[PDB]
Amino acid sequence: GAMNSSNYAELFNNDIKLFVDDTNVYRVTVHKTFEGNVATKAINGCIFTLNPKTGHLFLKIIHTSVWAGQKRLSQLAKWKTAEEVSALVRSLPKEEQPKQIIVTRKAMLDPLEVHMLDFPNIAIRPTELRLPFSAAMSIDKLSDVVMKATEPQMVLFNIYDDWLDRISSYTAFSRLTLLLRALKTNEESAKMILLSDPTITIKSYHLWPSFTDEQWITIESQMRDLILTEYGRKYNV
Amino acid sequence: MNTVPFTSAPIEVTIGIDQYSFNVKENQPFHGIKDIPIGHVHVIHFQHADNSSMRYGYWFDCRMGNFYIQYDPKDGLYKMMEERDGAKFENIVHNFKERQMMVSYPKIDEDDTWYNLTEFVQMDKIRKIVRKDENQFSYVDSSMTTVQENELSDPAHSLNYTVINFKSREAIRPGHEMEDFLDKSYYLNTVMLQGIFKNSSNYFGELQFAFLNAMFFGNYGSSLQWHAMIELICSSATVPKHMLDKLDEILYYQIKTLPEQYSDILLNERVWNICLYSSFQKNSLHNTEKIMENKYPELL
Ligand SMILES: Cc1ccccc1CC(N)=O
């Protein structure tokens, strides 16, 4: 069934599962042509495939060459996503394949179902959550590796850094979704908060700053405040 | 012209014969139906006055034998039977006709409706969908489930329609996932037409038989099958031109004959809107699109 606030804790049990977000697969800038018409120019994208229990992020970079000479690219992007997710699963050892794949947008269901026909015991699920995974390209290292790619490329990151050494998966996913919700609603403010302090650094192989537990509490509070303010503004409440 | 005599009519029942229907009273002197056109299959069907549930009936072809109806008070239904003795049969019928105790198959000469609804329906194909090889005729009722439905309980009583499933390995070539899902022509033309049905006539025969079972018996699995076979053609970019023209004629007469008050349950909104307005063949069903618009504009 669909994943929602009621069955949220299921993300952190010991059944392997992956979220797949396709919101950054097909990315364009819209511009005017010499004649004054509008055209698109694609830029590199990525599939965001995340194990929420472990923090594994299989970031499949989608190079602009995959669109060359193709029509209906927004439609093709969904099928390319499903092709790449199926290929990831096939590459994985049997004991490392997911039992569920949760897609963040319902339009991924049929393409993934069709590409996963060879895996009838892998459940393809939608979700009622409004997850902020689109903001993944606001994470500097992730954006940088996508834009620099010259060919199709899979890059492997822990999106939780080593937080799991001190906190649970549930808490790590909550912190991740808060940071991403913040970056999505006001990227500039969010980034100011994370890097304001020159003494707090990001390890060479990590994505986020090396906050102590107490600094994380302050950071998380600052991020919550950012999000509620923007919300008032959005609705005049 | 052939005859289906009745032994008697012990219980009050509405009897249908093809698209016609007659009310018969309990123990009314009624001994059958005469003047049935030769050359087509036919269906004779029943709805008891006391149980508007379970419509049931028999598909038959009078070229294949002499058939009659007799009520069974133990099983509680009108049963079709075959009479092997040609002379015994002629004699029974002749007597009943002489006593003018038979209704006449009420065919208007101008009317091609039944031909148009059964053009490709062949008794031998019905008998493979409805498996009961001791009889030459086939029983169908409202409740019988299809094989495909059974996959998702009694095999002997199933409708063995050809299983169509758009998200299946049979439908989707490895490496052509998107292509085959968005353009079902290889499923239609290679898998179904060339492989399973052998020709478009057998495909149309099963489509027409599914519609008629849905219409006469409210058989839900039959309706599912009818719509699936329509959607497979409409979702195919490449269809022989003779098939498209014939499909338009087939569906026109099905939509024409459908009871106006059943269009709610018998017509699937998504399939018809996708077929008439989004699919590859949105522009290939002019007659069907025109009768749907002027009769069921609500559904669309
Ligand atoms: C992607 C990744 C991240 C952290 C640890 C291990 C991996 C490799 C894998 N999951 O196959």
Swiss-Prot record, chain A:
Q: Could you tell me which residues belong to the region RNase H homology domain?
A: 7-237
Compartments where located: Nucleus
Superkingdom of this protein's organism: Eukaryota
Q: What is known of its domains?
A: The MPN (JAB/Mov34) domain has structural similarity with deubiquitinating enzymes, but lacks the residues that would bind the catalytic metal ion. Contains a region with structural similarity to reverse transcriptase, presenting the classical thumb, fingers and palm architecture, but lacks enzyme activity, since the essential metal-binding residues are not conserved.
Q: What does this protein do?
A: Functions as a scaffold that mediates the ordered assembly of spliceosomal proteins and snRNAs. Required for association of BRR2 with the spliceosomal U5 snRNP, and the subsequent assembly of the U4/U6-U5 tri-snRNP complex. Functions as a scaffold that positions spliceosomal U2, U5 and U6 snRNAs at splice sites on pre-mRNA substrates, so that splicing can occur. Interacts with both the 5' and the 3' splice site, as well as the branch region. Has a role in branch site-3' splice site selection. Associates with the branch site-3' splice 3'-exon region. Also has a role in cell cycle.
| Misc. remarks from the entry | Present with 468 molecules/cell in log phase SD medium.
Task: Cite the record's note on assembly.
Answer: Component of the U4/U6-U5 tri-snRNP complex composed of the U4, U6 and U5 snRNAs and at least PRP3, PRP4, PRP6, PRP8, PRP18, PRP31, PRP38, SNU13, SNU23, SNU66, SNU114, SPP381, SMB1, SMD1, SMD2, SMD3, SMX2, SMX3, LSM2, LSM3, LSM4, LSM5, LSM6, LSM7, LSM8, BRR2 and DIB1.
In its UniProt entry, what is this protein called?
Pre-mRNA-splicing factor 8
From Swiss-Prot, chain B:
**Location of the protein in the cell:** Cytoplasm; Nucleus
Sites bearing Phosphoserine, chain numbering:
236
Q: Leucine-zipper: where is this region? A: 244-265
Note the CDD domains from the entry.
Aar2_C (cd13778), Aar2_N (cd13777)
**Where are the coiled-coil regions?**
none
> Which example biological process does GO assign this protein?
spliceosomal snRNP assembly
Any idea which UniProt keywords this protein has?
A: Cytoplasm, mRNA processing, mRNA splicing, Nucleus, Phosphoprotein
Residues with PTM Phosphothreonine: 257
Task: Spell out the GO cellular component terms annotated for this protein, sorted alphabetically and separated by semicolons.
Answer: cytoplasm; U5 snRNP
Posttranslational modification: Phosphorylated on serine and tyrosine residues.
User: Per the record, a Pfam family?
Assistant: AAR2_1st
Give the family this protein belongs to, as stated in its UniProt record. Belongs to the AAR2 family.
Reported function: Component of the U5 snRNP complex that is required for spliceosome assembly and for pre-mRNA splicing. Involved in splicing pre-mRNA of the A1 cistron and other genes that are important for cell growth.
SUBUNIT field: Heterodimer. Interacts with PRP8 (via RNase H homology domain and MPN domain), competing with BRR2 for the same binding site. Component of a U5 snRNP complex that contains at least the U5 snRNA, PRP8, SNU114, AAR2, SMB1, SMD1, SMD2, SMD3, SME1, SMX2 and SMX3, but is not a component of the U4/U6-U5 tri-snRNP complex.
Q: What else is known?
A: Present with 7330 molecules/cell in log phase SD medium.
Name of the protein in its database record: A1 cistron-splicing factor AAR2
